[PDB]
Amino acid sequence: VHHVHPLPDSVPESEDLFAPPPRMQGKEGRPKPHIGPNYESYVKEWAKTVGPNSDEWWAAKARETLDWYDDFKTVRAGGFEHGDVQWFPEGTLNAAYNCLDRHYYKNPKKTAIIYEADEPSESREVSYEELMQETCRVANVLKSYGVKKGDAVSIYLPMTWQAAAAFLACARIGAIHSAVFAGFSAESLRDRVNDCECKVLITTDEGRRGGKTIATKQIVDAALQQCPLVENVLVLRRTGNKVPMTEGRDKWWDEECAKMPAYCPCERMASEDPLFILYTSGKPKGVVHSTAGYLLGTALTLKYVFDAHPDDRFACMADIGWITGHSYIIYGPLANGITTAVFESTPVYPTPSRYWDFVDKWKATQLYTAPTAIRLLRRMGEDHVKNHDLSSLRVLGSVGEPINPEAWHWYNDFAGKNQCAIVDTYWMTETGSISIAPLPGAISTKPGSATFPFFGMDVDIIDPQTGQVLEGNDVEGVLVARRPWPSIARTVYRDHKRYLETYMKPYPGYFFFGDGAARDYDGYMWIKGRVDDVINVSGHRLSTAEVESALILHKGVAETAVVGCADDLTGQAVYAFVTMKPEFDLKATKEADLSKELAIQVRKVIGPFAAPKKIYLVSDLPKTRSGKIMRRVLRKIVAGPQIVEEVKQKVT
C-alpha cells in the first residue's frame, strides 16, 4: 500500500485522525483561532510566506509584530553557502523594549511571569512593571561593571523568575548573554565561560529543584578557578544560606540593584547584532542568534502554533538553559505581551500531580513540555490527573524528541481530556523557533507526526544514498530546508567553519537538520530520529522512534531506547534497552518470555528484520538534563548520571 508507515500505534489508522476539537473552533467562549478551520486555510496563508514573492508578507509581519526604532529597507539577503544570512538588516530595535517596555506602557499591572516556586506556596505573579524595574536595575548594574554593547555575559541561574530579568538586562544594553543550565558541572560551566570570553557572570547562591539544593555558587567557585577573564560575579540571594563570596569579585544582586535607578535606556540594536550564544551539549557548540529574525520567529510561532491570544496564560515547563526556554518561556511569550510561566520544580515534586495542580491553580491555557516528562507521568499512573479540571487548556505541546503514539494518546486522553489540540513541535537550537508543527485550529493531527512546516519553512526529503531530492509523497530520507528563514542561527561562536561544515556542507544548497524524516501519502511529515541513530539491518533502514514506539505497545513498558551494533550476517543488529514500570512483577514474568513477547510485537508491526537481537532490562536510560536519550552512549557501550555504570554492568 504505502511505502511510509505511521509510528506504530494500537489504534487503527482510520480512527487515528484528530480534527481540531471544540475548544479550538471558537466554541464555549474560547478565542477563535488565528488560522482555521482546515488544511486549506493553513495552505492559503503558508503559501504567502515562501517563494519568490514572500517578502511582502514577511515585511508586513516584521513591522506589525515588533516595535522598531529604525525601519528596515532590505527584507532578506545571503544564504547557506557562506553563512551570511541577513533579515531586515537596516532596521534597529531592542529585544527588551519589545518584551517589557511596550507592554509595561500599555498595562503595567498585567502579569508577565507566573513564578511557580519549587514549593507551591511560595509562588506568585510578577507584573510587567516589576519585571521591567528589575531588568533595568540589573542592566544598570552591568553598565557599572563596564559591560558594553557586544560584550558576552554568562548566566548560571536556576528557574527562578529573575532569570528572565538577567537575560533581558543583557539584551537591553546589547550584551550577548550565554546561559548555562544550572546544575552543569564546574568543568562544563568553565568550558562555556572561557569560550565566550565573558568578563561578567550572573548566578545564585543556591538553586532549589525538587526539594534538593543546587550548590550553584560552590560550583561557580570551582569553575572560575580556571576562568581568568571573569572579573565580576553578581550573586542572586535565592536561598540566603551561607555561601563563599570573594572580596571585590562577588557582589549580592540585591545590594547592587538597590543603588541603581529603576529605569535604564535601551541600546538601539541592529537587526543582525548578536542576541545570545547558546552552547549545545565534540567541543561545545556556541550557537549564535541575532536579534530581529530570532525575535520575529519566536513571536510568530508562539502566536500561531499555540494560538496565543492576549489574556492567555502560557505554561512552558522547560528550563531557560535550553533553547525551548529561550524561545517559549522568555522571548516568544513576552514579545507577544502575554503571561508566561517560570516553573522551578520537577513534574513529580512534591508528587506526580504537580503539573495538573499547577494548571488548575493558575488556569493555564497552553501547556508545553517534553516526551520524557510525558512518559514519566505515564509511568506513575492515571490517578494524579484523573481528578483535575484542566479545562482552561486549549493546546498541549510536545518538544525534544519523537513522541510515541502511546505517549501521545496518554497526553491527549488525560491531560487534554480529548478536548485539546496536540501540537508536536519539531525544531532545533539552530532553527531558533518551531519549524514543523500543526496549526491547532486548522490541522487534523496524527499521533507522532509534526505534520506541516511553519511559515517561512520550505522543507524537502533527500535520499542519503544518492544525495538527491525525493519528489512527491510517501518518501523517506533525511530532512533538509531549501531557503533561510528569519530565526536561523547565524554562526557558531568564533567557529564559522564548523557552522558551514555541520549544516551547509553535507547537502550543498540546503540546510541539513541531522534527522531522519518521512513525508507520508497525505504529505504529513514524520521526524523519526537522528540520522546517526538509524540502524541498518540487511538493507532495512530502521529509525529509533519506529522500534521504540513498537516496544512501548507492550504492557508494563515505561520507556525504551534502541541502538545498532555491528553484525556480520545483517550488517547491523538492533539492541534494545527497556525500562519497565516499577510495579511490574519481574519474578512472575520470566525475563526471557518478556523479551520473546517484545520481539513478536516488533515483528508484527514493523517486520521480521526489526526484532532486537538482544534486550537489556535496565532501571533507567542515560539522559541529558533536557531529557534527550543518550543513544550514542548506549551505542558505544555495546561496542567496547550514575545510570551509566548500570548499563555497562548489565551489558557484561
Ligand X SMILES: CCCOP(=O)(O)OC[C@H]1O[C@@H](n2cnc3c(N)ncnc32)[C@H](O)[C@@H]1O
To 5 degrees, how large is the angle CA 429–CA 440–CA 402? 45
Give whichever of 270 and 420 is closer to ligand X, judged by the CB atom.
Answer: 420
Strand order in the sheet with 200-204: 250-252, 232-236, 200-204, 152-156, 176-179, 274-280, 285-290, 491-492
Instruction: Write down the residue that cell numbers 522571548 correspond to.
Output: 331
- To the question of whether residue 81 is assigned a binding role by annotation, the answer is yes
Nearest to 424 by CA among 405, 140, 432: 405
CA-to-CA distance for 518 and 187, rounded, in angstroms? 39
Give whichever of 530 and 541 is closer to ligand X, judged by the CB atom.
Answer: 530
Q: Closest approach of Cβ 159 to ligand X, in Å?
A: 16
Q: Closest approach of Cβ 110 to ligand X, in Å?
A: 28
Give whichever of 7 and 200 is closer to ligand X, judged by the CB atom.
Answer: 7
Q: For the chain, count helices (H), then strands (E).
A: 21, 31
Give whichever of 142 and 182 is closer to ligand X, judged by the CB atom.
Answer: 182
Q: What is the DSSP letter of 248?
A: T
- To the question of whether residue 596 is assigned a binding role by annotation, the answer is no
Nearest to 314 by CA among 255, 276, 365: 365
CA-to-CA distance for 401 and 408, rounded, in angstroms? 12
Q: Closest approach of Cβ 422 to ligand X, in Å?
A: 11
Instruction: Write down the residue that cell numbers 507566573 correspond to.
Output: 114
CA-to-CA distance for 222 and 216, rounded, in angstroms? 10
Q: What is the dihedral of CA 508, 511, 516, 520, to 10 degrees?
A: -100
Give whichever of 139 and 527 is closer to ligand X, judged by the CB atom.
Answer: 527
Residue 271: partners with Cβ closer than 8 Å, 6 or more residues away: 72, 86, 87, 88, 89, 90, 91, 92, 93, 290, 291, 292, 293
Q: Closest approach of Cβ 272 to ligand X, in Å?
A: 22
Binding site for ligand X (CB under 6 A): 280, 323-324, 399-402, 424-429, 450, 513-515, 527, 530, 626
Give whichever of 278 and 558 is closer to ligand X, judged by the CB atom.
Answer: 278
User: Alpha-carbon torsion 629, 633, 637, 638, what sign?
Assistant: positive
What angle separates helix 186-196 from helix 216-223, to the nearest 10 degrees? 60
Q: Closest approach of Cβ 126 to ligand X, in Å?
A: 25
Give whichever of 374 and 599 is closer to ligand X, judged by the CB atom.
Answer: 374
Instruction: Write down the residue that cell numbers 503571561 correspond to.
Output: 339
CA-to-CA distance for 397 and 641, rounded, in angstroms? 27
Nearest to 219 by CA among 183, 170, 174: 183
**SS3 (DSSP) at 242:** coil
- To the question of whether residue 281 is assigned a binding role by annotation, the answer is yes
- To the question of whether residue 206 is assigned a binding role by annotation, the answer is no
Give whichever of 280 and 419 is closer to ligand X, judged by the CB atom.
Answer: 280
Q: Closest approach of Cβ 318 to ligand X, in Å?
A: 8
Q: Are 622 and 630 in contact (CB under 8 A)?
A: yes
Give whichever of 49 and 626 is closer to ligand X, judged by the CB atom.
Answer: 626
Q: Are 590 and 617 in contact (CB under 8 A)?
A: no
- To the question of whether residue 185 is assigned a binding role by annotation, the answer is no
Q: Closest approach of Cβ 454 to ligand X, in Å?
A: 12
Cβ count near 603 (within 10 Å): 14
CA-to-CA distance for 393 and 410, rounded, in angstroms? 16
| Cα-to-chain-centroid distance, residue 32 | 27
Give whichever of 74 and 280 is closer to ligand X, judged by the CB atom.
Answer: 280
Q: Closest approach of Cβ 448 to ligand X, in Å?
A: 8
- To the question of whether residue 190 is assigned a binding role by annotation, the answer is no
Q: Closest approach of Cβ 336 to ligand X, in Å?
A: 19
CA-to-CA distance for 231 and 249, rounded, in angstroms? 6
Q: Closest approach of Cβ 253 to ligand X, in Å?
A: 29
CA-to-CA distance for 483 and 455, rounded, in angstroms? 12
Question: Which residue number has the CB closest to ligand X?
Answer: 429
- To the question of whether residue 41 is assigned a binding role by annotation, the answer is no
- To the question of whether residue 319 is assigned a binding role by annotation, the answer is yes
Q: Closest approach of Cβ 389 to ligand X, in Å?
A: 27
Give whichever of 75 and 428 is closer to ligand X, judged by the CB atom.
Answer: 428
Cis peptide before 310 (omega within 30 of 0): no
Burial of 429 (0-12, 13-18, 19+ CB in 10 A): middle
Give whichever of 62 and 423 is closer to ligand X, judged by the CB atom.
Answer: 423
User: Alpha-carbon torsion 134, 136, 137, 139, what sign?
Assistant: positive
Q: What is the dihedral of CA 618, 624, 630, 636, to 10 degrees?
A: -90
- To the question of whether residue 429 is assigned a binding role by annotation, the answer is yes
Helix ranges (DSSP H) in 380-472: 383-386, 405-410
Q: Closest approach of Cβ 145 to ligand X, in Å?
A: 31
Extract the annotated binding site for ATP: 281, 429, 530, 628
Extract the annotated binding site for CoA: 209, 319, 539, 603
Extract the annotated binding site: 81, 209, 281, 319, 429, 530, 539, 603, 628
Extract the annotated binding site for Mg(2+): 81
